[PDB]
Design a protein around this ligand. Structure first.
Ligand code: HEM
Length: 153
């Protein structure tokens, strides 16, 4: 369980993501795909992209990033009270997309990596720790819902 002070560190760096969610989503998805190329395979619409330049130029990739980060932002703003938001997400990701927990770990790593690069002003050590706690809570609660849904994840 996060403290309120921990949540405020998370929310202060999220406010900067929100200056330009599309740009942040491009950087985060591209880092994911570069670090763990197998994750790209899950995205049928743009799994054929070969290079970072292609990825940067992809409107479909850009929209996915916006979708992902906006949904994450809504979860973070709940400050752990995210049961409603996680239901549909867990169901789709378990049953339609088939996203394992290890791939959620990989995107969490990409989010931290990009925030650390972009936002040294709001992503020092305490803030990074708070964001890791928030992302760990997200993954723990999604993993519990995957189990309810029948998915080993
Ligand atoms: C912070 C973690 C994540 C969040 C908040 C997030 C959220 C979303 C949302 C809101 C959608 C659209 C609605 C839906 O289908 O449920 C979506 C679709 C999708 N997600 Fe995620 N997701 C996350 C991580 C991932 C990861 C790591 C992958 C793959 C490695 C992934 C693969 C996809 C795919 C393939 C789609 C469908 C794209 C399409 O048809 O346009 N998700 N996700």
């Amino acid at each position: 369980v996060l403290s309120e002070g921990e949540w405020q560190l998370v929310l202060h760096v999220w406010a900067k993501v929100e200056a330009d969610v599309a740009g942040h989503g491009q950087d985060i998805l591209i880092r994911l795909f570069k670090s763990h190329p197998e994750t790209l395979e899950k995205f049928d619409r743009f799994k054929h992209l070969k290079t970072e330049a292609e990825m940067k130029a992809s409107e479909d990739l850009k929209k996915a990033g916006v979708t992902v980060l906006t949904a994450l932002g809504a979860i973070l703003k709940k400050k752990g009270h995210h049961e409603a938001e996680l239901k549909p997400l867990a169901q789709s990701h378990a049953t339609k997309h088939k996203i394992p927990i290890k791939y959620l770990e990989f995107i969490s790593e990409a989010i931290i990596h990009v925030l650390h690069s972009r936002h040294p002003g709001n992503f020092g050590a305490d803030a990074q720790g708070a964001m890791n706690k928030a992302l760990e809570l997200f993954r723990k609660d999604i993993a519990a819902k995957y189990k309810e849904l029948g998915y080993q994840g």
